[PDB]
Amino acid sequence: KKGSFVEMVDNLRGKSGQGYYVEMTVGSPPQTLNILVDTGSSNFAVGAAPHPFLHRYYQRQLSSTYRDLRKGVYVPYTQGKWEGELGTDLVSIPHGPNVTVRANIAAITESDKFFINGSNWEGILGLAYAEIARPDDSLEPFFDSLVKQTHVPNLFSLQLCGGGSMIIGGIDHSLYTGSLWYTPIRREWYYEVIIVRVEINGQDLKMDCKEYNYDKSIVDSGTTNLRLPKKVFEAAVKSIKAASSTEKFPDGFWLGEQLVCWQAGTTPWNIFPVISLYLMGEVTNQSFRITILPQQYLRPVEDVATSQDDCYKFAISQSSTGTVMGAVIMEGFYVVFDRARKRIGFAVSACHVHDEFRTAAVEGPFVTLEDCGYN
Numbered sequence: 001k002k003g004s005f006v007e008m009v010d011n012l013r014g015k016s017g018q019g020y021y022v023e024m025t026v027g028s029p030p031q032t033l034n035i036l037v038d039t040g041s042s043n044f045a046v047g048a049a050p051h052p053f054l055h056r057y058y059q060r061q062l063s064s065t066y067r068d069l070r071k072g073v074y075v076p077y078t079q080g081k082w083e084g085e086l087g088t089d090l091v092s093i094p095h096g097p098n099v100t101v102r103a104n105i106a107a108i109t110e111s112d113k114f115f116i117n118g119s120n121w122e123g124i125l126g127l128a129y130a131e132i133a134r135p136d137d138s139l140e141p142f143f144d145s146l147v148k149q150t151h152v153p154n155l156f157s158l159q160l161c162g163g164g165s166m167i168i169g170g171i172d173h174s175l176y177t178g179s180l181w182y183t184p185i186r187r188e189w190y191y192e193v194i195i196v197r198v199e200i201n202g203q204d205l206k207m208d209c210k211e212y213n214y215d216k217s218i219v220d221s222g223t224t225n226l227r228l229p230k231k232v233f234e235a236a237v238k239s240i241k242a243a244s245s246t247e248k249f250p251d252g253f254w255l256g257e258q259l260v261c262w263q264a265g266t267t268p269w270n271i272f273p274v275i276s277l278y279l280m281g282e283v284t285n286q287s288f289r290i291t292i293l294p295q296q297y298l299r300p301v302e303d304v305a306t307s308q309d310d311c312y313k314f315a316i317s318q319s320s321t322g323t324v325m326g327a328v329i330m331e332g333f334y335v336v337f338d339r340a341r342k343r344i345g346f347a348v349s350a351c352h353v354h355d356e357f358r359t360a361a362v363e364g365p366f367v368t369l370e371d372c373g374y375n
């Protein structure tokens with residue numbers, strides 16, 4: 001049953017805080033590495049040299065199928081950077097499709113604040129499109145090579161839990177309930193989508209819908225938080241604060257830089273509101289909503305030291321580069337990256353979040369008798 005969806009189920013480990021990752025092999029003989037599943041980037045980039053935070057790394061000299069491309073790559077981010085060398089080599093996913101492809105690989109030789117202590121992965125699998133690949137869009141991303149070189153359908157789905165499942169090439173109906181609702185992929189670079197309405201405990205934020213997508217909105221498995229443009233973030237917070245006003249938290253909580261803790265088992269979920277993000281539908285002015293519980297946007301921080309308590313970071317934070325629907329949004333949903341039809345599907349996940357009062361949900365259609373996208 002190698003490569004059956006059944007065999008791909010449960011192939012991810014990790015958590016929203018440090019990343020979800022899938023086992024991969026590179027080279028011949030195969031070198032086993034854990035790799036971040038990242039829909040917010042487009043390079044297959046792997047530690048290729050010793051580093052304090054790396055338990056293992058890619059050793060190209062030991063791979064006889066490695067091919068050097070004689071091209072450097074330097075990738076700086078807001079937070080930290082990496083530098084490396086491009087080449088190609090044979091790549092497979094042991095708990096993924098039953099196939100081996102030749103793929104681009106950036107062998108990371110130096111990096112600053114890129115690898116994460118105790119995340120247990122050694123590289124990143126950028127699943128977004130070539131337009132954002134480094135050094136440029138001519139470096140073919142992994143998934144494109146996979147589809148090109150095999151009979152794998154041009155679609156993958158992610159079921160993140162809090163490991164989860166990355167199903168390549170198809171939809172595993174055992175991983176969701178109810179209906180699958182699709183939002184268009186606006187442009188093939190990041191997985192760009194359009195948010196048309198935002199409610200907090202059913203109260204509309206009442207902003208021009210372009211504000212929700214200033215200057216883009218993306219679906220990013222490589223981002224922990226729900227990240228919101230400043231104007232939207234401020235309104236969300238004001239609204240969540242109002243909803244939970246029976247308890248006050250330091251401003252550092254709201255800034256995401258400080259835990260809030262309750263005695264084990266006593267988190268007052270009921271004082272936090274639900275968040276509804278309405279996503280553009282596949283037909284004009286029809287939309288559907290995905291609803292997010294505090295169990296999602298309050299990210300638990302596991303720490304033996306604080307373990308008499310349950311502690312959390314606020315996992316909604318401010319962005320100056322557009323909305324990011326990160327891991328805490330994707331968790332408890334089954335998310336279908338249907339590249340073939342240029343759409344992203346959402347359905348309630350088998351591992352969704354709920355208590356006895358409320359539950360994560362995917363609901364539609366909603367009709368609204370304006371273009372919500374930015375240029």
Ligand SMILES: CC#Cc1cncc(-c2cccc([C@]3(C4CC4)N=C(C)C(N)=N3)c2)c1
Nearest residue numbers: 016017018019040041114221222223224327
């Ligand atoms: C879920 C999760 C997670 C997670 C936790 N810590 C670190 C990372 C992490 C570590 C290194 C880089 C990145 C990266 C970068 C390639 C562009 N940056 C971004 C916003 C993204 N989508 N991928 C993320 C991910």
